[PDB]
Amino acid sequence: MNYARFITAASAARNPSPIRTMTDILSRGPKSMISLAGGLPNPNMFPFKTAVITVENGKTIQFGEEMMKRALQYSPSAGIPELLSWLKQLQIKLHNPPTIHYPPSQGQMDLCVTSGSQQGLCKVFEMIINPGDNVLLDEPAYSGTLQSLHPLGCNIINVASDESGIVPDSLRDILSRWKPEDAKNPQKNTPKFLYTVPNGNNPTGNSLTSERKKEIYELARKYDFLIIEDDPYYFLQFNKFRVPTFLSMDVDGRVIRADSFSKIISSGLRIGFLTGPKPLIERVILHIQVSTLHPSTFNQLMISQLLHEWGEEGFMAHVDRVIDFYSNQKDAILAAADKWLTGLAEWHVPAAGMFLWIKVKGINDVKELIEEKAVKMGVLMLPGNAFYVDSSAPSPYLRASFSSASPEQMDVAFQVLAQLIKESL
Template sequence: MTFLSWSSSNDKGIPELLSWLKQLQVKLHNPPTISYPTSQGQMDICITSGSQDGLCKVFEMIINPGDNVLLNEPVYSGTLQALKPLGCNIINVASDEYGIIPDSLKEVLSKWKPEDSKNPKKNTPKFLYTVPNGNNPTGNSLTSNRKKEIYELARKYDFLIIEDDPYYFLQFSKSWIPTFLSMDVDGRVIRADSFSKVLSSGLRIGFITGPKPLIERVVLHTQVSNLHTSTFTQLLVSQLLHHWGEEGFLAHIERVTDFYRNQKDALLAAANKWLSGLAEWHDPIAGMFLWVKIKGISDVKQLIEEKAIKKEILMLPGNVFYIDSSAPSPYFRASFSLASPEQMDVAFQRLAQLIKESL
């Protein structure tokens, strides 16, 4: 059998994969917009070459130079690198171990009146971007109640919500937190999903879900940039998903999550063993990262980028996850995706010694 490598009808994605993913989104999120007419923001899906590809196209679609956009730092550094060249004003909304703090969002929005959203000269925020589950780098997740408050503020001030959720399937609790997409009655949520964390990052397959008029414009962007996501890769993923079925896919997700849960427990055991009294952290409830604050050191950049690397410890300093990456940060991000429990133990033992020497 021969498959065409390119077809103008496949810019959005191959039909069999799109159909499967649409059914999955309905099963997992049951978006209110699934039955809406196109003019009212009917839910639609397109395939992208990884969720980063889709998010960059969404940002370029929405943002004009000088626009205000909202996010909560620390934030995925790839998002900052995508936003900054677009010339927008990035406004931080404070967050804690439970995600964005609604009162902080209210405070940020208080400089505008709700009716200002109808006047382009008022420059009200275009969107709020957030990673709601297992945030990279903090491992924090936004609670359901906070999501409801945030969504109501989005309705009041008429801005979009970009729900970047690559760690949705890696929630350690058996009860998954409802998504913004599941409560989207207006067609104002654009959701990015990825197979990178649960199948393979090398596949470069993601999908964007959102209002049909906006998804159509993402597809137009695809037509003039990379034409479409690899048909071969889409067919590979589609055949696998159809072979598994929805229940088989979710069973696979459970096995992957069990692996990451065990990895997380091993890293926390090593942290408690070696870093107690030297650092502080919150247990991540999703994802693959631990966000650690070292006590007594205001900026850990040199410690992590120079001294730790010499001891064969690879982690990221916290400053790269902030809008102003030049500002000092006492935080670092540790990943538990690949290291063995033995490697984690040795790494934190060596790090503890470095911290003591630096105090």
């Protein structure tokens, strides 16, 4: 409601730059118009002329001469129109956000293509956080979010989590050190936002429930903080009945949602998307505008034409197939764990994503066992340390990835590991 409180002096001073009133009155003017006003270079000097791109499970993609020229040219900051229209329509279909037909000053839903979903996150973090500000998340927390929040100098307050994600009473009893009304008052510092990964958390594999999601939201107006919903494994959930998202229940316009194509379409293409209240998305767009300018027009055209040829039908069917492959690799890594981990380790089953989070028994830090002993045996896994704010504390946990290894490779891995644990007890 008071969007000015979630926007820095730096971000607030952004004015609309580039690629301006040029491809604009000449996008609504007569064909006779002549413009010498734009800042675009001649695309005919570019060496690549056509593209053909083969697709498994939908039809091949062709960039003719005219196309290619457009694929190689600058495009709008927030994305190409056809992919913006497709995504927006996708959110409505998927999340039906209460917010789609609010007035803009009031948090009308807006969306922008970013260069990966982590670019719009970083841009959100940058737009919001002053030095000293308090922010809510749950540990263990993705190491990248930890390393992007660090220099912004916020105080990160840890919210207790378990097999089912943030624990509401922990949120509520953290929050009880303020009155719901100091949110109206800048000086002693109510939390600016809560950040979470609701589905298959990196590194835990844990997801929030729908009952917990509504409690967290309630807490969210109550002390009037924003919810950053960083949701890159939303299309990667093992239950094929997906829980509603913070976006689906966002009646107030306090939720910015990051989606990722990286696990389902392409990591290397750098195309992800940001959903939120219109004037905050504006602040990230003014920033994109002086920065990357926009996501590669080539890679958007590819994805948009893939997506339009699929229908949200072929899209959704594509995700069920990739889901299936990730349950089957989950099955395998779990069976490996039961097989070799023994009353030696405890874990929960992953609900989404690609990570197993295993807590090693009566070993109080796992750096030496992995940095030293496992590597020498040809098996690598990831010490839990870097998934905490104080990463110097000992972690008895390992993250093991199941996205790629064959069941044999898991089997050998968990064999070698189980015995290095016992030779350490």
